[PDB]
Amino acid sequence: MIHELLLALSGYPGSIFTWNKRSGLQVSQDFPFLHPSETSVLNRLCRLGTDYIRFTEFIEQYTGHVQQQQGQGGLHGIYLRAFCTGLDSVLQPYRQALLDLEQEFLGDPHLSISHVNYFLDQFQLLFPSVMVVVEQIKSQKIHGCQILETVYKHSCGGLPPVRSALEKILAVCHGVMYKQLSAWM
Amino acid sequence: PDDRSWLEHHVVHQYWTARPSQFPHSLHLHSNLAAVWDQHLYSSDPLYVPDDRVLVTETQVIRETLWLLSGVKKLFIFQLIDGKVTVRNNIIVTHLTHSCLRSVLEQIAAYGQVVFRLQEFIDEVMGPFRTYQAFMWALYKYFISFKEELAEIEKCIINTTITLAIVVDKLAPRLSQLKVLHKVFSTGVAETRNVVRASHLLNTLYKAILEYDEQTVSLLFSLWVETVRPYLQTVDEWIVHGHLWDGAREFIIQRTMVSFLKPVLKQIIMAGKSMQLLKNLELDDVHDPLLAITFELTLRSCLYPHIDKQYLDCCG
Amino acid sequence: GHREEPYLTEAGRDAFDKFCRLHQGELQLLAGGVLQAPQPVLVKECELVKDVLNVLIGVVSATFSLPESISSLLSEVAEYGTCYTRLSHFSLQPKGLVFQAFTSGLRRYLQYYRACVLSTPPTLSLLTIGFLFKKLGRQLRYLAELCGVAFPTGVKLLSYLY
């Protein structure tokens, strides 16, 4: 149940947390050896893994799916690929954290699930926060330069980790514009 | 057998599912007090239908409490009544007379409601204003340090001996600091416009620091600085960028009136506008080192030379 | 004393194995005895890690033919070697002269992919593999879309790549 959660969380959903796409991860259900006290902590941790699997799926989906042949900048288009490029390297500390968790579980196996929860709760706010930006881009068919303002309006807020995390992505998608401007000028 | 017995050994899950647990111990009155009290009742002729208590051990009840107290919700013991934790009445260990028990768990449950409501405030933020987010971020920075100690205690239940009278005294410097939040937040949860909703919230904190002008004051101070962060950004931005830009009058100044910046507000407006007429032809990174080198009284009057000199620069 | 005795939030590596064994037994009962599972461990962790490192060389193990969550990690890292082989046999020649230069240029990357595995790791954890060979293994799979595995060749292929 312990190791299984880490494997599910990295993007390998187990036979305990069964991945559907209309509902994400789901526990197998009430059994007489389990009761809600651990269950709720597990569910709260499973939220972040739902989001993470969606992220990896989208980044994979829009980078490396054509040998590059219209008017499309949202099913295709260099800016979308630039966002997908930024997003995974911003997601690097999550992977680093999961890697850490396996080592701590190896050192002493009796460590609690709340032990996992408090370490991962620096991410518990930031992971809903970055989701609305990608959701905006996907839903409203935001393409070309318009992606920059979509990220930029939420990189003028009042939470430091959200600001830095979005800042790295905006550097990348600035980079494609700079590469075109550096020759055209 | 073969799975149920091996479970019964390793896993604890039997005092709240089928075959309620029976605890053999040292007997004779010094910790056999519950059974003596039951026999006393039975001699005293109720007479029939004994009191339903399912017999959970104590050290466990400590674990379930610490889980509830840390801030994760939805445990089977301690039912809700409207979202409020209340004591469950099947608990008995082998003593504690079941009445002092029902009071002491109620007291700690009352402290659990205080943190429950704050986590509820936050849980409805994950399913803009930008002051609410800074508020929640302050609460969390406190919360994680609180949860860490409890989480450490949970290992040490397996380890020594741990009992109620120890964990109550050990959590004394926290249960002091929770009571103030129950009063501060109770006016921060009681209210429409984003400018009165911001001023009324800032004003509670600004009042609470001058109220006691030492663990509570560090609490009020560190929640103070982490929530005035939007305002300071806007205060600098009106000056140096020569324009005002708000959410929807999300800034309490309008081109709704706290006294927090009143002794310099004129100098703010007369600088912010005067830059705009220059264009037509970092104060936060000062404030955060200011805390390193009276609180919100003389200290705030030492912030003001730095912004006064800047106004002087602009108008000149 | 008697030690509070491992909880679900608690102990792993033995209770974890016990738990997964029990859940598999639960599934087996809940069907009627008509669901059949393979071996629950294969065969260990570190031995399995060295086996999957050998899969990246280009030799797939004899457990493949053309815990239980191990399958989900395992398929993703397993398919990398099977497409590496699907590049190497379409690089076996000693026509298009520029096409032959193109094939040796493909070997310039395939040798790098064979060199990075088992010249770096002493031993790594199981999840380190799936994270580490993500930026590289997906990049390896990108080249299969490039190749046919007709198929334009010669100046036609050279000019498209230009």
Swiss-Prot record, chain A:
UniProt feature coiled coil, ranges: none
Q: Which domain of life is it from?
A: Eukaryota
Q: Where in the cell is it found?
A: Cytoplasm, Cytoskeleton, Microtubule organizing center, Centrosome
Found, by tissue, as follows: Ubiquitously expressed.
Quaternary structure and partners: Component of the gamma-tubulin ring complex (gTuRC) consisting of TUBGCP2, TUBGCP3, TUBGCP4, TUBGCP5 and TUBGCP6 and gamma-tubulin TUBG1 or TUBG2. TUBGCP2, TUBGCP3, TUBGCP4, TUBGCP5 and TUBGCP6 assemble in a 5:5:2:1:1 stoichiometry; each is associated with a gamma-tubulin, thereby arranging 14 gamma-tubulins in a helical manner. Gamma-tubulin at the first position is blocked by TUBGCP3 at the last position, allowing 13 protafilaments to grow into a microtubule.
Q: What's the family?
A: Belongs to the TUBGCP family.
Q: What does this protein do?
A: Component of the gamma-tubulin ring complex (gTuRC) which mediates microtubule nucleation. The gTuRC regulates the minus-end nucleation of alpha-beta tubulin heterodimers that grow into microtubule protafilaments, a critical step in centrosome duplication and spindle formation.
Instruction: State the associated disorder.
Output: Microcephaly and chorioretinopathy, autosomal recessive, 3: A disorder characterized by congenital microcephaly and chorioretinal dysplasia associated with poor vision and nystagmus. Variable ocular anomalies include microphthalmia, retinal folding, retinal detachment, optic nerve hypoplasia, absence of retinal vessels, round areas of chorioretinal atrophy, and attenuated electroretinogram. Most patients have mild developmental delay and mild learning difficulties.
Protein known as: Gamma-tubulin complex component 4
Q: Tell me the part of the parent protein that is shown.
A: 1 to 191 of 667
From Swiss-Prot, chain B:
**GO terms under cellular component:** centrosome; ciliary basal body; cilium; cytosol; gamma-tubulin complex; gamma-tubulin ring complex; microtubule; spindle pole
UniProt entry keywords in alphabetical sequence: Cytoplasm, Cytoskeleton, Microtubule
Q: Does the keyword tRNA processing apply?
A: no
Q: Which GO terms describe its molecular function?
A: gamma-tubulin binding; microtubule binding
GO annotation (BP), single: cytoplasmic microtubule organization
Which compartment or compartments is the protein found in? Cytoplasm, Cytoskeleton, Microtubule organizing center, Centrosome
Tissues in which the protein is found: Widely expressed, with highest levels in heart and skeletal muscle and moderate levels in brain.
User: Which purpose does this protein serve, as stated in its record?
Assistant: Component of the gamma-tubulin ring complex (gTuRC) which mediates microtubule nucleation. The gTuRC regulates the minus-end nucleation of alpha-beta tubulin heterodimers that grow into microtubule protafilaments, a critical step in centrosome duplication and spindle formation.
Its subunit composition reads: Component of the gamma-tubulin ring complex (gTuRC) consisting of TUBGCP2, TUBGCP3, TUBGCP4, TUBGCP5 and TUBGCP6 and gamma-tubulin TUBG1 or TUBG2. TUBGCP2, TUBGCP3, TUBGCP4, TUBGCP5 and TUBGCP6 assemble in a 5:5:2:1:1 stoichiometry; each is associated with a gamma-tubulin, thereby arranging 14 gamma-tubulins in a helical manner. Gamma-tubulin at the first position is blocked by TUBGCP3 at the last position, allowing 13 protafilaments to grow into a microtubule.
Q: Which family does it belong to?
A: Belongs to the TUBGCP family.
Task: Please report the name of this protein according to its UniProt entry.
Answer: Gamma-tubulin complex component 5
Q: Which organism is it from?
A: Homo sapiens
Curated annotation (Swiss-Prot), chain C:
Q: Where in the cell is it found?
A: Cytoplasm, Cytoskeleton, Microtubule organizing center, Centrosome
The protein's superkingdom reads: Eukaryota
Its quaternary structure? Component of the gamma-tubulin ring complex (gTuRC) consisting of TUBGCP2, TUBGCP3, TUBGCP4, TUBGCP5 and TUBGCP6 and gamma-tubulin TUBG1 or TUBG2. TUBGCP2, TUBGCP3, TUBGCP4, TUBGCP5 and TUBGCP6 assemble in a 5:5:2:1:1 stoichiometry; each is associated with a gamma-tubulin, thereby arranging 14 gamma-tubulins in a helical manner. Gamma-tubulin at the first position is blocked by TUBGCP3 at the last position, allowing 13 protafilaments to grow into a microtubule.
Q: What does this protein do?
A: Component of the gamma-tubulin ring complex (gTuRC) which mediates microtubule nucleation. The gTuRC regulates the minus-end nucleation of alpha-beta tubulin heterodimers that grow into microtubule protafilaments, a critical step in centrosome duplication and spindle formation.
Indicate the disease this protein is implicated in: Microcephaly and chorioretinopathy, autosomal recessive, 1: A syndrome characterized by microcephaly, cognitive impairment, underdeveloped retina and choroid, and epilepsy in some patients. The more anterior parts of the retina, near the periphery and pars plana, have a grayish hue and diminutive vasculature similar to retinopathy of prematurity. Visual impairment becomes evident during the first year of life.
Instruction: Give the family this protein belongs to, as stated in its UniProt record.
Output: Belongs to the TUBGCP family.
Query: What name goes with this protein?
Result: Gamma-tubulin complex component 6
> Which species is this UniProt entry from?
Homo sapiens (Human)
